[PDB]
Ligand binder design. Structure first.
Ligand code: MG
Ligand code: MG
Ligand code: MN
Ligand code: MN
Ligand code: MN
Ligand code: MN
Lengths: 309, 309
């Protein structure tokens, strides 16, 4: 009866932070909940965990294997993004900031979705609404989740209310927003220590675009050209992944967080549709896409339009 | 920019109350929201609107027709229970206490689902959470929804937090909980004014139970015996429906909403799948199903299990 609280596959900072923050809150409310992760923390999240001196959630792969019948999803609701046997257990709660799709429950449940910058932002309000004090380290993982998802509040996903949230969490966490923000974001640009295969699967999701299974990965870097130093291995890793997972197209978003621009490297059957989604020309399989920092707002939408559905 | 707020087709008290109350709330929050209905009030709801003297929402049939592109749904989420052009508009918010299915959004949205007795109960908390004092008449329709969906807090669907809510909405609406409730519930048991075919179809559903097509209807009455005065005319309307709709089994629930029992009348090929389902014996085509007041929580399972899985 231990309720498992977890974010999406290829957990990012917001996924981990929101699940940890929410699990703690559930416990304060008398619920036997435990935060777990569907994968190992990425470099950005590792930085956060280390910073506030807390351990990463246990990594699990099957709810049933862990003997759990009830789960709480944070930072996602779509089944392909959840635990492998999500269809076999009961989803009792969901706290997320994404559109809803490929989600279904047999019974009523709790749901708190808000079209804001991060799932962590929502959990924060739940602490306030329940009158539960926020511990320093919990504030830290929540703040980190918000900072992560909004690129230190500079991303188009930043909601009007997020800055105030970010400000209060920073205070509770004992950090200077800009200083901590920049340090953490930079921690995610540690890509050299990763293999090409791992690099393209650090932060990636799949989208069904008018019948095409399109993989869209993102990475934060201090320089697009640095990431391209291994373009060959990366393209190779991309083609391999495409064959292994059934992807007709693979889009790699190389985001320069300093200059707020992203390089688009795409391979597959419909690279021409990619070129159409952004009106550019892929040379050696990539092109510059100025001002792009958000996958959900500045990439998927145009890819959706060009592929159509 | 004009958001319609509505409950589900064939609205009950909760559907009407929750949309009216919530729409009012959004307006106090600066959102140009308007409560609309997908049908006219039933005897129960007409009794409520009159008691607190307020007009029932205007019945509409299309969001596109009302000049609205955005909509807020209360007391439901499944598209088949919604507005005709639901897939054509944007769902900006959902307040409900049902399971989720046949629901999808292209973009992020606000969702507030809680596994409680009524949708009105959730709206109640939304008022307090937003610092908006609840208006007398509004408390009236909200209280009615809660009392209606939970049979004056007696149903298995009643949540631990529902009583206090019911209690507080009564105080605000200026009524005594126990009297207004009974008086309101009794007011809605008007069956003699409807034809047999109408009864067996005012609140029924269909369930595929291993190849069988079983109709399961529910009628609220203050006295089963009285409805049993029309047994014959009923079995006729039943046999008829089974002929026209292919139904292999028809189970009628004559729910006595004051004692919490439901006499089960069954005609069909598997009138044994039912007995073995409620461990009773159909003496005259019907048996006594004590404690039954909820179809899915007290009738579906056993049926679902007797027909085996
Ligand atoms: Mg992201
Ligand atoms: Mg009901
Ligand atoms: Mn995430
Ligand atoms: Mn997120
Ligand atoms: Mn309803
Ligand atoms: Mn309801």
């Amino acid at each position: 009866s231990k309720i498992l609280v977890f974010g999406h596959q290829n957990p990012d900072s917001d996924a981990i932070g929101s699940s940890m923050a929410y699990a703690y809150l559930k416990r304060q409310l008398g619920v036997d909940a435990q935060a777990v992760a569907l994968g190992n923390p990425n470099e950005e999240t590792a930085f956060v965990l280390d910073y506030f001196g807390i351990q990463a959630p246990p990594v699990v792969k099957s709810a049933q294997a862990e003997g759990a019948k009830q789960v709480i999803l944070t930072d996602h609701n779509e089944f392909q993004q959840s635990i492998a046997d999500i269809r076999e257990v009961e989803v009792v709660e969901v706290v997320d900031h994404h559109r809803v799709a490929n989600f279904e429950t047999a019974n009523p449940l709790y749901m708190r979705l808000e079209p804001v910058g991060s799932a962590s932002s929502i959990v924060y309000r739940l602490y306030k609404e329940n009158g539960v004090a926020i511990p320093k380290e919990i504030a830290g993982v929540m703040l980190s989740g918000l900072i992560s998802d909004t690129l230190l509040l500079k991303s188009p996903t930043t909601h009007a209310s997020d800055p105030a949230v970010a400000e209060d969490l920073a205070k509770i966490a004992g950090v200077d927003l800009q200083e901590y923000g920049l340090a953490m974001l930079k921690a995610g640009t540690n890509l050299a220590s990763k293999t090409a295969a791992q690099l393209v699967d650090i932060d990636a999701k799949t989208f069904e675009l008018n019948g095409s299974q399109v993989r869209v990965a993102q990475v934060n870097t201090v320089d697009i050209n640095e990431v391209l130093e291994r373009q060959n291995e990366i393209e190779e890793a991309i083609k391999a992944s495409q064959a292994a997972n059934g992807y007709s197209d693979f889009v790699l978003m190389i985001t320069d967080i300093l200059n707020s621009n992203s390089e688009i490297l795409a391979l597959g059957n419909n690279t021409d549709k990619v070129e159409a989604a952004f009106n550019f020309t892929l040379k050696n399989n990539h092109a510059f896409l100025a001002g792009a920092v958000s996958r959900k707002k500045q990439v998927v939408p145009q890819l959706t339009e060009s592929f159509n559905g």
